[PDB]
Every structure is written in structure tokens, then in C-alpha cells.
Amino acid sequence: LRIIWGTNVSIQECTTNFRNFLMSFKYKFRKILDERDEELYYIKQLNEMRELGTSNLNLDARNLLAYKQTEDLYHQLLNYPQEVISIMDQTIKDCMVSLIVDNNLDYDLDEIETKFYKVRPYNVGSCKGMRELNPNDIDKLINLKGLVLRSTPVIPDMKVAFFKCNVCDHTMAVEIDRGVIQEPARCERIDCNEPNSMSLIHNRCSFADKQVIKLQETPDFVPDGQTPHSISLCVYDELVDSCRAGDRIEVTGTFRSIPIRANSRQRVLSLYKTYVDVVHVK
């Protein structure tokens, strides 16, 4: 198969593994909750978003341990949680096509096949607070229980750039997808023009949203000496303006750390700052 330098994860068996997990399910999981429903919650809901148009599937993600297969998927999910969502976002759009190929009268077969969807695994495992966050927890899922305090308005992100030098007309749009904007040093739109002054027409290329939110843990069974400390949030999608400040929270997020510039005007840097990146809140 295709093995990556970065991860150790597989190829699209999980697509095939999801489909037999999803379609041949109809109920499971009674064995842990043995007290003593003929169709799975996901199956009817998969038809529901098809006729609502929404882009969000709130996956319980506590089924791969309640299914005989998908164990290695399940433990890769708690171990490479940036690639495996990017694999799973390809499946749901294609599994939507797997219901679209049945009846060809279903919303003209183009427009619900252009806007992307996304998934939301949540309630995965459990944590207990903040005095357990060890440095080895680099790319894992964390299940916090705390309190939101205050917010900020949205600052924008750099998802696409724009350029134009002083020729008559040049509307290129360079992508970034990094921490590095790359630039040319030669002209364009002619066969003979020198290394010209390339200008940065900033207010033309589109930007999405982003919001940082400050959290402090709820002082839960604190031993009457310790002060509840802080951590921050970063959201990307349309979970903005729904996390208003002042309510109890249970977040479902990944982990990330960033460097800081030590001098404000140099690129020199080293006690890092971390944060979390939310995939789904509650």
C-alpha cells in the first residue's frame, strides 16, 4: 500500500471499512449496556442532510469499539487526528454519491455534490481536568470540562492570495496552504519585461473566519489551595457566535503548539505556548 513518511496510516480500506460498518449495522452496542432500534441513527440521518443540505455530521464516534472491525482505524483516530478526518471527509461526499447513484432525480446531481461536508467526532474517551496534560500529548483528542470567559471579534485568515505588478493587467492568485507565502521575481503577461515591482492588492482575495476564545477550567474538586488556570480556543467553521461567553462547556478538541517571537522585531524565538483546536463543542 501507500505508506507515508509522516504517519503510519493506511490507504482507503477505511472507506470500504466505513461502508460495511455503516450499512450493515442497524443496531449494535447493547452488550455493554445489557439490560434486556431496528435501524441505525446514522442511516436515517444520512438521508436527512441530503434533503436539508447541511454540511455537518455529528458522529458519536463511540462505535468503532462497539464494532468488531475498525479497531486500527479507531486507535489511529486518537493518534493522527488531522489526516484521518481528511480521509473521512472524502468518504462522506462519495458515500453521498453512493446514495445519489441510486435515484438520479435527487437535487439535480450537481449542487449537493459541490459544497463540501464535514464530520464531528465527539465524546471520545474521557479526561478529568487540566492537571494531567503531559507534554507527550502532542496530537491527541482531549475532552475538556470548563468555563468560557470572554471573546473577541473575528480576525481573518490567509487562505488565498492575490498579486499584480505594474503591467496593464495581471490577476494571478497564488495559494499558500503553509506558513510561507511564495512570490515571483520575474514579470509576466509579456515575453520581455524585467524583474518588476510586484504589489500586494490585499483586499481582493477572500478570507474566512477565525476566533480565539479564552477558557478557564471549572474548579472541580480542587483541593482548596489551587487557583483555576487558563487555556485558549481556536475555531474555524461556523461554530462562531454560538459559543457565547458565560456558560458551562465540554469541548472535543485536538492539540497543537506554536512558537513565539521573543523580540517583537526579530524572528528569533522558547517556552512555547499551546492551545487546542475545536472540532465540535458542547
Add this chain to the structure above:
Amino acid sequence: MSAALPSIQLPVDYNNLFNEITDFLVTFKQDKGPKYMAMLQKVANRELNSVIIDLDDILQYQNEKFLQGTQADDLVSAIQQNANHFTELFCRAIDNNMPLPTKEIDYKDDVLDVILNQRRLRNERMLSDRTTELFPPNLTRRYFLYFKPLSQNCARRYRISSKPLSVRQIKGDFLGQLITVRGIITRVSDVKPAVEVIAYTCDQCGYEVFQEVNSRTFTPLSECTSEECSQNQTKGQLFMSTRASKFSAFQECKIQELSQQVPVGHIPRSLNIHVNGTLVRSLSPGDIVDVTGIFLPAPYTGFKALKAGLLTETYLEAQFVRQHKKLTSDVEERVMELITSGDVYNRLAKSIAPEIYGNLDVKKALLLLLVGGVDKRVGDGMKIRGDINVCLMGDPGVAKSQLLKAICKISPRGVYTTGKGSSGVGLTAAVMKDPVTDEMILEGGALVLADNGICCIDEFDKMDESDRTAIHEVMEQQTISISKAGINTTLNARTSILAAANPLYGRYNPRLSPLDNINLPAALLSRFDILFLMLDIPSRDDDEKLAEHVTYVHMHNKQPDLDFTPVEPSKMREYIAYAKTKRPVMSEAVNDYVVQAYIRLRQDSKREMDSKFSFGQATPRTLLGIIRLSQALAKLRLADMVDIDDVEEALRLVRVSKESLYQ
């Protein structure tokens, strides 16, 4: 280079110590085989990451070098000379004598397992991919080192470096050594990931450039420096990587002095301490502890010319912590000692606070409230009142403060307070100034941290503009909040109140009207349950006994007497905690006996109607409180006997708490 760059020839070298750590191989057979090698096996199988290389295994190793008459230099000499140099030659001795594949890990069951071997094989196959950079030794450790000195009778055997010196005398030649200091830990920061290794990827060659981590500021390098992706017309542009960069633990703390070994002069000063390895998350604010560790100064690297000439601002680096002074689980033998001996109403009354004269009524009124218990599991949305509050008043000269507050410093989770400091605005939490780290945190007072405990207050006439709000808001159920311009979130309220109001000038005149000295009528006559008094009447027989009472404590130093065996406070604490796990349910004859009690409570209170002595006009809020303390005393003395006699103990207390002014 010239101008005194070479030094004098020193007789103390390192190669004589380098081979002496080579004979720290399997040779120490006194202390099942090589014992320090046995600990080497319980780390490689990945369950614990702290070795302990003490001085005991060095001194006994020097004890059985008493017979080999050869030149063996001293070890505790050099390791107190320059202690920090004794870890880098140490790790370069373990690797030649480390048994590597002694564990069994297949795919999972180890963090960062297949990928480091993926990384190692990606560098191992690239060790022979020409038809090259070795690992810096910091990459493959997955372990740390530690040290531990001695202050036992081995120091009195034969010969110091571990006397607990204070911070005051420490500035001399004690810089670059290993010294322990006791203190009190304050200013606990958090745990942040520090850097020890690096990995830049350029996405063209994949050759991850490694470097040692220097001080807190450093700089990335260029992209045309490598061996494959360099040296052409195209160079891969470098950037960082997270998962291929191992990160450590780090947390900062500050010490002070014991306030008993300080001289008569100056104030004590602080000191900086760090952590490494895995001693982290093991200190607390208020720990009367001591740390043993090694010494080094640090450069400042900022504004070093005009200011910062040769200032030093050192810290100490930690090595060991020796912390001090810390339910049917090998403790049931003392729970039986209360069950077999019995004696609830009197021996426990003499147990808590036996250091006064008389007043067995009030020492009994408090022990019932030190157990509490869930009032009623209401289920529906009827949040009933619990946790009644008793207030005191009167002006004795027996220093009333250390009567009540001595109970608070042994009772569980019961925080002390006073008038100054956390006033009624800072009784709850608020937002304040912080250091250069995350400001606008929610700093608290007492009630946001002492939930469901004891709020032992004094000085009730102090800061009353904020306090008079503060007492109602906890007597009112569940509105401890921060109604500021920051947030409108509200937290719980479940704590009992024990108040002691001081009178007006001189004595409270009992012939005058009461409430001449307490300023809250509405807080008292309707929202409390019971009162007391500490009035002083002249009486000859008691005071000479009270005179012998206070003079007996001076010639000796001990205070105990009067045929009472003193009881350990853990025993009743276990008895309270066991009593808090019962919660009996009342019968029907008890509510039949209180309706006749309240009628007899109604009729006589509706006879006086005067402003001479008495308070109250028989509220049901007093009626529900007398049900509250009954099941409380039925909780502590649970023999499953909720009956007429159990509540007869209850009205026995309300009649003696009342009319304490009639003398």
C-alpha cells in the same frame, strides 16, 4: 591564543573519573543482583522515567574500597565541586552498558513507537544510500537522571554537603554546587512544553537537521546547508515539524523563608527554582518542604551594554523533593473504639476544644454542625434550605478569637477569615491584575473555594458596606456570583456560617435593650436559628478556679486534666465522615411530636409581645430548623432510633441556647 588563555595545570582531571564510572559496571554486589542495574530494566520496558543515583550506592562502593590499596580519588568531593558536570559524562557511560531489546511492544501499547523506528530506519537506510549525520546523543534517551544526598549517621560515621542551610548565608562559594534549602513554596506556574531537540523539514530531501537547544531564545538556520536538497539550483525551503520534535516538562516556582530563622532585621527574599525530568506536578502553594538540587547562574542576553553589566540573577536547579507534614481501609479499628466505648454526648464534647472553662452547652452546639448531611434528596425543583448557621455575641476577656478559630484550623475545609483583606466584595471571586502571563484570571476570596464547609468569620463590624450584602447572599441559597461587567455566571452556595459579633463600647448593658450593637435586624430575627452569649457576671468560686486555670499553664507547659482521655482528631473526622454516609429517614411519631411542640412554642411566644428581653415571634423558619438539627443529631448518634426521645435531645438545646441573657 595569547594573553593568559591557558591556565595553570590542575591535578583534578576528568579522565580519572571517566574510567571510574566505567567501574560503575556490574561490580556493586553488596546491594537481586546488581541493584542499580535492576532499576535499569524497569525503565526500558516503558513504565517509569526516573532513575535515582544516590550517594548511598557511592559511599558503600567506597566502603568496600577500604581494602584495595590503590589511588581512588574522592567522589563526593568533585560532585560538590561542580555538580552539573556530573550528568553528561554519566549518560555517555550508560549506553555502552544498556540492554536494549529487553521489552516486548508489538504495534500499540507505547507512545511514539512505530514512528521513531520509522524515523530510525529512515536514517539507518540513509546511512548507506550513496551507492550522513549521526544522531546527537540527546535524541534517543527517553529517560532522565537524578541525584540524592545524605544527612544520616553515615555523616557521623566518617568524613556535610547536606545541612539544611537557609537562604540568608548562601551567596558565597555555594554557586555551582549542590545544596538543599527548606522554605515555603509560592507562585506556582503551570506546566509548559520546553524544547530539547529540533527537526526542520524542507520537503525536498527530507533530511531533518538536528541541533542542541540553547537558552530561551534561538534562531532557525537557512535552507542551503544540507547534503542532498542543497548544492543545486533548487533548494527545499525549510520549515518546522511538531511530531518529530520531542518536548519536555517545565514549571517555575519561588521560595521564601520559614519566618523563624530570619534575623531581627531585614525582610526575607525570594529565589528561583526550576524542574526537569518527572518531579513535576508534585509541589503545592503552602508546602512546608525542602528541595535538594544543583546550582548555576544564567546570562541575561538583553540590554547588556548600558544596563546589565555583569549581573547574574541566578536560579537553582532541582534534583529531589522530600515533602513533609501531610473508610474501611485499615482504619476501622479506631471507628470501633467509639462504638465500643460509646460516650457520644459527653466525651466527644470534652474532645473538641478542652482548653476553656465551662461552656459545655456551646461546645455541643457545634459538633452537630460539623457533620451536616444532605437535608432531603428533593428530586423535583424544590431546592430546600440546608446547613443552618449559628452566631455568637458577647465580650469576654478570654480572647474569644482563639476559641472559635482553633476549632476552624482542625475542622475539615474550614477556611479562616477576618475583617481586613477578603472583604464582602472580595469574598466571592473577581478579576484582578496578574503578572506578564495570562491576566484577568478569576481570583477568589473564600466562598468560591470553601464550598460546603466552615466559613469561620470574625470582626463583624468591619467593612460592612460590602459584608452586609455578603452575608445575605450566602444565607440566600445559590447566588454566589460575579455580577460584574465581565460575566454573569453564578456558582453554588452550600457552606455554614459561624459568626461572633463584638458588642458596643464597654460591656453590652443587659438592662438596656438588645440589638444596640448588632446592626442587622433583618438578618437575625428571621433568618437564623439559635444564639448564645458570653456575658460575664462576678462570681467568686469560679474565678479563683479560673485563676488557677490560667496560672497552671505557666509553671509547666501542659494543660490537660479532669479525667478525660484526649482523642485524636482523625477519629471523630472518620466518625463524622461515616456519620455523613448514613442519612436516616424519619418516622411518623416525630412529626406528630413537633406539631404539638410548635403549638407550645406558639402560645408562650404569643404571651410576652414585649421589647424588654426576648426576640422572635415563632416563625416556621425556626420550626423547620428544629427538624434540621434533629436529624443531624440523629445522624451522628445513629442507632436507627428517630423517635420522641431523639427530638427530646433537640428541644433540650433550643431552651438552653435561648434565655442566655436572663442572668
